[PDB]
């Protein structure tokens, strides 16, 4: 079937005070990102926005799962209800709740995030890895 039912097209950290965009294009080469970092200044709020298409049928029980790492070890597994989506033309977008970038030098450092977007079939609609560095400043 030429193109798959669920195509994850992008990840964006939506953050009002970041000086520049913070987008990953997930339709391209995913191997580019382990060389790139997103920087968040400590303490700022952000959301994560995942953009995806549903091309030809109901997806139920979508979930966005996040395993976060510091220094090679797993410090957090979080997952979010995405829900149910029917096929259409325009990409959909899913926004996590508002979170706060950690503050304090128990917080600052480099984090690596393994993301999956799945549903109830445990379909790998996509998995990708990216980096997040938390800093005293931009």
Distances (CA, A) of 105 to 39, 69, 73, 86, 135: 15, 16, 18, 44, 9
Neighbours of 73 (CB within 10 A): 6
Q: What technique solved it?
A: X-ray
In sequence order, the 6+-apart residues with CB closer than 8 A to the CB of 27 are 7, 9, 10
Q: Does domain 1-138 have CATH number 1.10.150.120?
A: no
The three-point CA angle 38-79-94 to 5° equals 65
Q: How far is it, in rounded angstroms, from Cα 35 to Cα 119?
A: 29
Residue 129: name the closest of 39, 47, 31 by CA.
31
In terms of residues, how long is the chain? 138
Per the structure block, which two tokens stand in for 51? 């953009």
Domain ranges of the chain: 1-138
CB 23, CB 10: distance < 8 Å: yes
**Distance from the first to the final alpha carbon of the chain:** 44
Neighbours of 44 (CB within 10 A): 17
3-state secondary structure of 91: coil
Count Cβ neighbours within 10 Å for each residue of 7-17 and write b for 16 or more, e otherwise.
bbbebbbebee
Q: How far is it, in rounded angstroms, from Cα 122 to Cα 119?
A: 6
CA dihedral 2, 10, 38, 32 (to 10 degrees): 20
Count Cβ neighbours within 10 Å for each residue of 81-116 and write b for 16 or more, e otherwise.
ebeebeeeeeebebebeeeebeeeeeeeeebbbebb
Q: Are strands 73-85 and 126-135 parallel, antiparallel or unpaired?
A: unpaired
Neighbours of 59 (CB within 10 A): 21
Q: Give residue for tokens 């706060």.
A: 100
Q: How far is it, in rounded angstroms, from Cα 43 to Cα 45?
A: 7
CB 32, CB 129: distance < 8 Å: no
């Amino acid at each position: 079937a030429m193109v798959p039912n669920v195509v994850v097209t992008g990840l964006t950290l939506v953050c009002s005070s970041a000086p520049g965009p913070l987008e990953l294009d997930l339709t391209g080469d995913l191997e580019s990102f382990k060389k790139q970092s997103f920087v968040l200044k400590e303490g700022v709020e952000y959301r994560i926005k995942i953009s995806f298409r549903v091309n030809r049928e109901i997806v139920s029980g979508m979930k966005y799962i996040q395993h976060t790492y510091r220094k090679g070890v797993k410090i957090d597994k979080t997952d979010y209800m995405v829900g149910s989506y029917g096929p259409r033309a325009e990409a959909y977008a899913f926004l996590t709740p508002v979170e706060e970038a950690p503050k304090g030098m128990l917080a600052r450092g480099s984090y690596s995030i393994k993301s999956r977007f799945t549903d109830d079939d445990k379909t790998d609609h996509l998995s990708w890895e990216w980096n997040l560095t938390i800093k005293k400043d931009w």
